[PDB]
Design an enzyme around this catalytic site. Structure first.
Site, PDB file in Angstrom:
ATOM      1  N   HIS A 225       6.402  -3.603   2.791  1.00  0.00           N
ATOM      2  CA  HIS A 225       6.893  -2.863   1.636  1.00  0.00           C
ATOM      3  C   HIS A 225       7.574  -1.584   2.098  1.00  0.00           C
ATOM      4  O   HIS A 225       7.031  -0.847   2.929  1.00  0.00           O
ATOM      5  CB  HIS A 225       5.749  -2.535   0.675  1.00  0.00           C
ATOM      6  CG  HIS A 225       5.760  -3.353  -0.578  1.00  0.00           C
ATOM      7  ND1 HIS A 225       4.912  -4.421  -0.776  1.00  0.00           N
ATOM      8  CD2 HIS A 225       6.511  -3.255  -1.701  1.00  0.00           C
ATOM      9  CE1 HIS A 225       5.146  -4.951  -1.964  1.00  0.00           C
ATOM     10  NE2 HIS A 225       6.110  -4.261  -2.545  1.00  0.00           N
TER      11      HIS A 225
ATOM     12  N   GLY B  52       0.818  -1.197   0.000  1.00  0.00           N
ATOM     13  CA  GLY B  52       0.000   0.000   0.000  1.00  0.00           C
ATOM     14  C   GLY B  52       0.857   1.254   0.000  1.00  0.00           C
ATOM     15  O   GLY B  52       2.081   1.211  -0.136  1.00  0.00           O
TER      16      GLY B  52
ATOM     17  N   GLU C 100       9.377   3.424  -1.041  1.00  0.00           N
ATOM     18  CA  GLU C 100       9.663   4.851  -1.116  1.00  0.00           C
ATOM     19  C   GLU C 100       9.143   5.530   0.143  1.00  0.00           C
ATOM     20  O   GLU C 100       8.358   4.956   0.900  1.00  0.00           O
ATOM     21  CB  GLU C 100       9.051   5.474  -2.373  1.00  0.00           C
ATOM     22  CG  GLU C 100       7.571   5.799  -2.252  1.00  0.00           C
ATOM     23  CD  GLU C 100       6.698   4.561  -2.198  1.00  0.00           C
ATOM     24  OE1 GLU C 100       7.188   3.467  -2.549  1.00  0.00           O
ATOM     25  OE2 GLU C 100       5.520   4.681  -1.804  1.00  0.00           O
TER      26      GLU C 100
ATOM     27  N   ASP D 235       9.123  -9.224  -8.352  1.00  0.00           N
ATOM     28  CA  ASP D 235       8.053  -8.273  -8.059  1.00  0.00           C
ATOM     29  C   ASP D 235       6.910  -8.438  -9.049  1.00  0.00           C
ATOM     30  O   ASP D 235       5.815  -8.876  -8.681  1.00  0.00           O
ATOM     31  CB  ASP D 235       8.567  -6.832  -8.072  1.00  0.00           C
ATOM     32  CG  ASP D 235       7.530  -5.841  -7.581  1.00  0.00           C
ATOM     33  OD1 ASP D 235       7.067  -5.982  -6.430  1.00  0.00           O
ATOM     34  OD2 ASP D 235       7.177  -4.920  -8.345  1.00  0.00           O
TER      35      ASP D 235
HETATM   36  N1  LIG Z   1       4.554  -1.958  -5.325  1.00  0.00           N
HETATM   37  C1  LIG Z   1       3.287  -1.889  -4.618  1.00  0.00           C
HETATM   38  N2  LIG Z   1       3.121  -1.026  -3.628  1.00  0.00           N
HETATM   39  C2  LIG Z   1       1.973  -0.947  -2.971  1.00  0.00           C
HETATM   40  N3  LIG Z   1       0.952  -1.729  -3.282  1.00  0.00           N
HETATM   41  C3  LIG Z   1       1.047  -2.627  -4.274  1.00  0.00           C
HETATM   42  C4  LIG Z   1       2.225  -2.736  -4.977  1.00  0.00           C
HETATM   43  N4  LIG Z   1       2.061  -3.694  -5.903  1.00  0.00           N
HETATM   44  C5  LIG Z   1       0.831  -4.167  -5.783  1.00  0.00           C
HETATM   45  N5  LIG Z   1       0.206  -3.531  -4.803  1.00  0.00           N
HETATM   46  C6  LIG Z   1      -1.149  -3.764  -4.373  1.00  0.00           C
HETATM   47  O1  LIG Z   1      -1.887  -4.834  -5.349  1.00  0.00           O
HETATM   48  C7  LIG Z   1      -2.764  -4.182  -6.003  1.00  0.00           C
HETATM   49  C8  LIG Z   1      -2.099  -3.572  -7.274  1.00  0.00           C
HETATM   50  O2  LIG Z   1      -3.047  -3.048  -8.161  1.00  0.00           O
HETATM   51  P1  LIG Z   1      -4.539  -3.727  -8.336  1.00  0.00           P
HETATM   52  O3  LIG Z   1      -5.398  -3.378  -7.145  1.00  0.00           O
HETATM   53  O4  LIG Z   1      -5.193  -3.161  -9.573  1.00  0.00           O
HETATM   54  O5  LIG Z   1      -4.447  -5.368  -8.478  1.00  0.00           O
HETATM   55  P2  LIG Z   1      -3.202  -6.206  -9.159  1.00  0.00           P
HETATM   56  O6  LIG Z   1      -3.759  -7.261 -10.081  1.00  0.00           O
HETATM   57  O7  LIG Z   1      -2.402  -6.879  -8.069  1.00  0.00           O
HETATM   58  O8  LIG Z   1      -2.213  -5.187  -9.998  1.00  0.00           O
HETATM   59  P3  LIG Z   1      -2.658  -4.330 -11.331  1.00  0.00           P
HETATM   60  O9  LIG Z   1      -2.722  -2.859 -10.995  1.00  0.00           O
HETATM   61  O10 LIG Z   1      -1.638  -4.548 -12.420  1.00  0.00           O
HETATM   62  O11 LIG Z   1      -4.015  -4.792 -11.803  1.00  0.00           O
HETATM   63  C9  LIG Z   1      -3.165  -3.040  -5.031  1.00  0.00           C
HETATM   64  O12 LIG Z   1      -3.991  -3.513  -4.060  1.00  0.00           O
HETATM   65  C10 LIG Z   1      -1.827  -2.649  -4.441  1.00  0.00           C
HETATM   66  O13 LIG Z   1      -2.012  -2.058  -3.068  1.00  0.00           O
HETATM   67 MG   LIG Z   2       5.873  -5.547  -4.847  1.00  0.00          MG
END
Ligand SMILES: Nc1ncnc2c1ncn2[C@@H]1O[C@H](COP(=O)(O)OP(=O)(O)OP(=O)(O)O)[C@@H](O)[C@H]1O
Ligand SMILES: [Mg+2]
Ligand SMILES: Nc1ncnc2c1ncn2[C@@H]1O[C@H](COP(=O)(O)OP(=O)(O)OP(=O)(O)O)[C@@H](O)[C@H]1O
Ligand SMILES: Nc1ncnc2c1ncn2[C@@H]1O[C@H](COP(=O)(O)OP(=O)(O)OP(=O)(O)O)[C@@H](O)[C@H]1O
Ligand SMILES: Nc1ncnc2c1ncn2[C@@H]1O[C@H](COP(=O)(O)OP(=O)(O)OP(=O)(O)O)[C@@H](O)[C@H]1O
Ligand SMILES: [Mg+2]
Lengths: 600, 592
Positions: free
Chosen positions: A448, A420, A451, A533
């Site tokens: 995490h 998050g 940053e 990642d």
């Molecule tokens: N580097 C990151 N930092 C913080 N949160 C991340 C990170 N990578 C993934 N997440 C979390 O997973 C989700 C990333 O985006 P999303 O909610 O759309 O689902 P996802 O399938 O995992 O990724 P995408 O955005 O490609 O669809 C979010 O809930 C996010 O909080």
């Molecule tokens: Mg990650």
RNA sequence: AAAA
């Protein structure tokens, strides 16, 4: 269970049936090495063993040497006999050896081979007649003339028997270009013992997977820094991936198209988002903001995996990519709430159960056919949203806690991810009381630190959240106290070379002079683990992530890559017994791949 | 040395042809044979008479001929091994050839050579099979006789003390036989995580016989091996070392003011000590240590003498790293302007002076680090915990010194008010200053207290804590978080009571903890009170925990190294030295 | 059971 019987006759073929009937319990097969001398009679052995079709038998002929005369002939014969022995262990158990026939040198060579590779029992057969007929051994054994002498019991070196994979691709070892490779193996063992004994300083320690038996040339090659040319060795290396988001695996290209294909109902699938221009992925030459990097993956994820077929195809493709990369253990981070949909009775729990079920099915079906498989656990990512709905984190924690209770299954939930927005608005200080439940239930916690990660924030993460693994945290060496605490508490950091290369920007990207701290972390002893990642958005798998360290961290040695794999194993969220099993498997595979790479 | 070794048979050619195996002459050659009348020694004796320098020795296997029977073969093998060990050259490995003799005798000699070492195993061959010695001279002149040698053999270094434990036995029969090595050979695979838990990766270089002996269960007879091991002590109170005996006398006699030293009171003695057959309460256990401690160590001179004697005992026990727990306030008095800080400084300076003096002389030295005990409810008001925590924090800043304060210790007597979950408020500073926390969460402590110490107090090690088997969740938490437990087998055996002590059926959980994966360590608690140093504390495991292996002892030492409060840079070199020392001692302790 |  198979009791392979080994023997060898000069010209007198009576020894092999003598050994066979020495133990009335019976065996499974007998294999005998013999010279190509015309004086030997294999017809008698063939007709005697033809009466027992249930017992396999074979004869191997050493071409080009009727007898042992000079040093070269005996050396080549010993090489051939060692190779033939190497092709004829039981797959798991040890063979049996008899030394009643043949010349003294060849019998001694066979005994040396049995000592080197190990054997269940080493014996001989004795008789008071030394006959030549075949219808008399039965009378001799009935009367008691047959005498067997049992003296040998030897385990040998497990590592020195692990080199049964070096023998082939040798065109029969003809005289023109014969290669005594098992001679190289015995030089290996002699040299290892001799550097161990005659030297004390350089021969102190260093092997992380406890290999310590590879030929010294292999050890020197391991010490030398790796280059981009070592991709062949890296690819064969059994690796561990700990930071691999499920939703960012197939975000563009053929994988995205074929996961859109098998998406149950294709009516709701829409062509959204687009790749980024001028970005020479995966080796970008410009920093990318975290928000834009995340949006780059919007083609696949929460809006797409809402249907069961698409999610199943995505997880199957991810497992196929993992096994194609020789990744022997993985921990996939998945957000079940993202793919939940109450409209079709598709809650978060059933989404997580679907992921678990398909992963278990894939692993079990791979294990059934006895092929390489990637034991994969799951991390329920309890991301921060704070667009309202504060109960989202509580629901994620409760789902993660209650998903462990499945008990069975090769794939299981092992921990949670505290991803998050890592801003000060959602620091780890507030959640010292929420996480008592997750800690009491045996779950692990990974955090995490991509940053705006102030050292106080990381301190709170590792001391209030009790996180056993950190994400990124590329500025640990800025705060020496934080680095000391991470060193002492034996917590690991998940560092992704490509994600950190693109998001933060390191050498040799222009206008960026910051150096990748992986080498410094490894020297300091940080339990660093190279991961991916996001295979999709970052555009590279684990092999490329390991390879890029040749550029991000110049002077990185292959032994450091083995150290990275060992640290990934040690910091993985696994039980002790499974950890030891994984360590044994990784040691064996590392030995095999190192031998192959050094020889070729 | 320069010794050849061969077997005899129908033909006597074997020794003359093997004589010139070396191309620059040989020194002395010996021959082993049976009692068969076919062999004549006259030809070999005449041929050796031409070169008086060489020592010719002929040994005949009495009462045996043609080696045709199982018992006859076993007899011959035993006598061959005895003769080989008695004829073992002192320093240099001998040459050996096995072209002559029966296949059985040749195989037995090859096994002997590969088990006790050999400078080279070689062979002799001649196409025409000469008979008259003139045919040998012709063969060496026109050079058909080749020499077959499969590769130089290292042999396993330590098997020669058997020749010392057995006499010559010129007169022998079938009554005397020693299955000393065959017992380890038979149990090679006749007996899952054992191999995976292999510490000190140089152990793989060990002989397969040595590795198998390492896998064998521990016994009380290998005290010599367990003493030469470099060990690590992580739970050793400073004030429980010189309690009774000559040590107490020589620590009292070095006091600056002998007049004030009470030399009258002595601790009581219990039959069977230290292997007491009856359990004892913890209060009486501390009472045994009343001869030494606070009321004695007030004097500076006697305190320095106590530290010196403790270090000398640690070195004499071959302990290569120790973490001595001290309570400076117990030995600090304001009568002579002796604060707790100056007491800690005196202890630290004595330890570092001893270590530096031993290091400059290149002897074996025990690296020592200090733990400041933060006692609870001992001297009255509870400001002592804060004072001790501040003392540890300030003393860790000294920087210079081979001996440094690495952490604090929390001490609880029995239970309840002595729980490790009342003073969680002070410890943020000690955690942030770089120190480590250890808790005496032992002696029948409830799981909640240990859990609180693990999580709220961030303790990296736990004292004793023998009741983790009854709390599977706590055991898992300890295992996954890599938190070591320091248990003292002798102290727990004397206090709690376990098998094989009479009237007690509970068994020590040492083996169960090792199998589960807990980073368990074996320590001394109080050397003086328990009357047992680290070597015998490790040795008593073979009695408290049957089926424990020597490799398990090595794993215990590795766990002690891993759980020590040391920097990674120092830990790597300590591990390297420990690996080299372990390999060296194991390569010179299969000799018995 | 090729220098028994
Ligand atoms: N580097 C990151 N930092 C913080 N949160 C991340 C990170 N990578 C993934 N997440 C979390 O997973 C989700 C990333 O985006 P999303 O909610 O759309 O689902 P996802 O399938 O995992 O990724 P995408 O955005 O490609 O669809 C979010 O809930 C996010 O909080
Ligand atoms: Mg990650
Ligand atoms: N991808 C993998 N492939 C093979 N073995 C693995 C793999 N991952 C883990 N292992 C471990 O190897 C063993 C699987 O095979 P098995 O249990 O039958 O023992 P094994 O055959 O002696 O070992 P191996 O399969 O390496 O030859 C287990 O110990 C398992 O933990
Ligand atoms: N088993 C234990 N349980 C609790 N505290 C202990 C234990 N062992 C030692 N201690 C601590 O050591 C001290 C006990 O005795 P004291 O203060 O007089 O000096 P000592 O040298 O450590 O031991 P003693 O003088 O009793 O022989 C206290 O600080 C105590 O907290
Ligand atoms: N009791 C000990 N005896 C010998 N070496 C030790 C002992 N304890 C620790 N060591 C390690 O040996 C080294 C101490 O000597 P030094 O630092 O000068 O290097 P070195 O002389 O090359 O190693 P060594 O002393 O083993 O020959 C350190 O690496 C130290 O960790
Ligand atoms: Mg104690």
């Amino acid at each position: 269970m198979s009791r392979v019987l080994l023997c060898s006759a000069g010209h007198s073929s009576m020894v092999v049936p003598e050994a066979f009937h020495a133990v009335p319990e019976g065996f499974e097969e007998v294999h005998v090495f013999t010279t190509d001398s015309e004086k030997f009679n294999p017809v008698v052995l063939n007709d005697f063993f033809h009466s027992l079709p249930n017992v396999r038998f074979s004869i191997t002929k050493c071409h080009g040497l009727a007898d042992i005369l000079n040093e070269r002939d005996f050396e080549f014969y010993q090489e051939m006999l060692w190779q033939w022995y190497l092709t004829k262990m039981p797959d798991n158990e040890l063979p049996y050896v008899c030394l009643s026939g043949g010349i003294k040198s060849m019998s001694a060579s066979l005994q040396k081979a049995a000592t080197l590779f190990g054997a269940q029992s080493v014996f001989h057969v004795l008789a008071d007649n030394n006959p030549r007929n075949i219808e008399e051994m039965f009378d001799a054994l009935q009367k008691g003339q047959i005498h067997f002498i049992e003296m040998g019991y030897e385990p040998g070196w497990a590592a020195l028997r692990r080199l049964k994979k070096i023998l082939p691709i040798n065109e029969g070892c003809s005289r023109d270009n014969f290669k005594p490779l098992i001679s190289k193996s015995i030089e290996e063992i002699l040299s290892n013992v001799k550097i161990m004994a005659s030297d004390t300083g350089k021969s102190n320690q260093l092997p992380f997977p406890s290999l310590a038996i590879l030929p010294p040339i292999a050890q020197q090659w391991l010490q030398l820094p790796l280059s981009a040319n070592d991709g062949a060795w890296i690819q064969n290396l059994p690796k561990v991936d700990l930071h691999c988001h499920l939703g960012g695996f197939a975000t563009s290209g053929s994988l995205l198209d074929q996961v859109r294909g098998a998406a149950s109902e294709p009516d709701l699938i829409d062509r959204t988002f687009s790749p980024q221009e001028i970005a020479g992925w995966p080796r970008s030459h410009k920093s990318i903001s975290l928000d834009k990097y995340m949006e780059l993956g919007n083609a696949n994820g929460s809006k797409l995996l809402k249907d069961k077929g698409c999610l199943i195809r995505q997880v199957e493709l991810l497992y196929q990519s993992l096994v194609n990369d020789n990744v022997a253990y993985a921990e996939i981070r998945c957000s079940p709430n993202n793919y939940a949909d109450k409209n079709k009775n598709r809650s978060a729990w059933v989404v997580l159960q679907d992921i678990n079920d398909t992963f278990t099915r894939l692993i079990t079906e791979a294990k059934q056919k006895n092929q390489f498989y990637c034991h994969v656990n799951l991390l329920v990512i309890a991301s921060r949203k704070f667009s309202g709905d504060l109960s989202d984190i509580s629901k994620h924690l409760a789902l993660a806690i209650t998903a462990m209770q499945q008990g069975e299954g090769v794939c299981r939930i092992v921990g949670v991810d505290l991803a998050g927005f890592e801003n000060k608005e959602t620091r780890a200080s507030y959640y010292e009381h929420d996480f008592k439940a997750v800690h009491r239930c045996g779950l692990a916690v990974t955090a995490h630190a991509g940053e705006n990660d102030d050292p106080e924030g990381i301190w709170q993460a590792v001391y209030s959240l009790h996180a056993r693994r950190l994400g990124h945290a590329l500025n640990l060496l800025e705060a020496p106290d934080l680095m000391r605490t991470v060193i002492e508490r034996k917590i690991g950091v998940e560092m992704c070379p490509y994600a950190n290369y693109q998001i933060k920007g390191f050498a040799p990207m222009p206008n960026f002079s910051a150096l990748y701290p992986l080498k410094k972390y490894l020297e300091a002893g940080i339990l660093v683990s190279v991961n991916t990642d996001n295979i999709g958005i970052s555009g590279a798998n684990l092999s490329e992530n390991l390879l890029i360290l040749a550029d991000l961290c110049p002077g990185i040695s292959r032994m450091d890559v083995l150290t990275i794999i060992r640290n990934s194993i040690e910091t993985a969220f696994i039980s002790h017994d499974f950890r030891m099993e994984l360590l044994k498997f990784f040691d064996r595979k590392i030995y095999d791949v190192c031998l192959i790479s050094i020889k070729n």
